Amino acid sequence: PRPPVEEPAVETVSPEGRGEKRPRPDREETLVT
């Protein structure tokens, strides 16, 4: 519903959940948003 966000107030977009090249499938490791 909302992209991930850091809070340094200011409101900063967090880079977590983004797609990457991985040697192992990314769903069994992380949540991909």
Binding site: E6, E7, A9, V10, E11, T12, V13, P15
Partner: peptide, 29 residues
């Protein structure tokens, strides 16, 4: 700090990320 140019989500500016300013898009790497 140019935070009056950002849309306020609530009472705070919805600033972007520092690491998103560049690009590294390239064919094959």
């Amino acid at each position: 700090n140019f935070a009056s140019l950002a849309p306020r989500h609530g009472s705070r500016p919805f600033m972007g990320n520092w690491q998103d300013i560049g690009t590294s898009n390239m064919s094959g790497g």
